[PDB]
Nucleic acid binder design. Structure first.
Lengths: 157, 156
DNA sequence: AATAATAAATTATATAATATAA
DNA sequence: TTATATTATATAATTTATTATT
DNA sequence: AATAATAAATTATATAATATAA
DNA sequence: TTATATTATATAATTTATTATT
C-alpha cells in the first residue's frame, strides 16, 4: 500500500541482509535424504518427489518427526538471538506522534471498557477520544512529542 | 523478467546521456525570475502558465534563437548518444525467423500494400511456416554461428 | 502491438512455525 | 488484530524474454 | 487494516521534438 | 505503425508515508 520512503528503503534493504529464518523440520529430513529419494524413485517429476515426502511426513513414526523438530528448535533460537542483536543496531525510527502516545496510554482502559469491540473499532474509539480531549490536554501530548523529537534530533543530527 | 545480460546492459544504458531540454525551457530558464517579480501573487505553476503564454507570443526572431540553441544541444546529444551506443555490448543476434522476415519484407509489402506491419508479420509468419526445410535451415545455421560469435565476444 | 526460434527465468512441490503485510 | 509470506532444495516441465521491423 | 499529527514526497504547470513503449 | 514518455525548473500546494499497537 504505502510506497516506501527513502529511509524505509534503507531499513528494508538493511533488514534483507540480516539474519534470516531457518529452514523447517520437514525440510531438514529432505537435506539429509535428497540423494536417497532419487536413487530410490527416479521416475517422477521433482515436484512429485516432494509430494511423497509430505505423505511420508504425515505417516512417519513420531520419534522421527521429533528428532528433526528438535533441530528446527535449536536453529530458530540461535536465529532469534541473532535477529534480536541485529535489530538493535538498526537505525532507530522516529518517535511516535502525540496521538500514538496518547493511544498507547489509554488503550488498556478503553479495552477494559469496550471488551466487545475489535481492536480496529477500538482505535476508532480512541481516535474520537483524542479529538474530544481538552486542548490543554492535547498540548501535553504535543509537548511530549516536541521533547521526544528534540532529543531524537540532538542524538541524530 | 529480467535477463542476466539485459541487467548489465540496462545498467549501462541507464548511464547514457539524457536528451536535452526544449526551446521553451531555455526561454523559461532565462526569464522565470522576471516573471515572478512581475506577478508576485501566482503559484509557481501559474508562473509556468504565464511563461507559456509569453513563449507563444514571443518575438519570432527571439524564439528562433532558442530553437536554434535547442537544435544545437540536440545535435550534441545525438553525437554523444551514438558514441555511447557504440561502446555498449550489443544485443543478441536476431532469430532465424526475424532474419527471414527482414529479407522478404519488401517483396511481401509490395504484394500487400494495404496491410500494417502487424498484418505483414502474420503473412510472413505463414510464409516461414511453408518455407522449404533446407531454406529454414540456412537461417537457423546462420543464427547458430551468430550466437556462437556473440557468446565469444560477450561472455558473462 | 504482430511474428518464431532460442535463451533464460520461473514454477511445481512437500512442511509449519512465525515473521510480516494490511 | 487477521490474513499472507517466508525459510530450506532439487531439477523437470513450463512459461516468458529476446530480437528487428513499422 | 484502524487511528492523528507530522514528516516526507509529489503535484502543479508551461513545450514540442523525438525517443521509447506496445 | 500509433501512443505515450522524456527532457528541463521553480516552489507553493497538496497528497502520501510514518509511527505503535492488536
Amino acid at each position: 500500500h504505502h510506497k516506501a520512503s527513502k529511509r524505509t528503503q534503507l531499513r528494508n534493504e538493511l533488514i534483507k541482509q540480516g539474519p534470516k529464518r531457518p529452514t523447517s523440520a520437514y525440510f531438514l529430513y529432505l537435506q539429509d535424504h535428497r540423494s536417497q529419494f532419487v536413487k530410490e524413485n527416479p521416475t517422477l517429476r521433482p515436484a512429485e518427489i516432494s509430494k511423497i515426502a509430505g505423505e511420508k511426513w504425515q505417516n512417519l513414526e513420531a520419534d522421527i518427526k521429533e528428532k528433526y523438530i528438535s533441530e528446527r528448535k535449536k536453529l530458530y533460537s540461535e536465529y532469534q538471538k541473532a535477529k534480536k542483536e541485529f535489530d538493535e543496531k538498526l537505525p532507530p525510527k522516529k518517535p511516535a506522534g502525540p496521538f500514538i502516545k496518547y493511544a498507547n496510554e489509554v488503550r488498556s482502559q478503553v479495552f477494559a471498557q469496550h471488551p466487545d469491540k475489535s481492536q480496529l473499532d477500538l482505535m476508532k474509539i480512541i481516535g474520537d477520544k483524542w479529538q474530544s480531549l481538552d486542548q490543554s490536554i492535547k498540548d501535553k501530548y504535543i509537548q511530549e512529542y516536541k521533547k521526544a523529537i528534540q532529543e531524537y534530533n540532538a542524538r541524530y543530527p
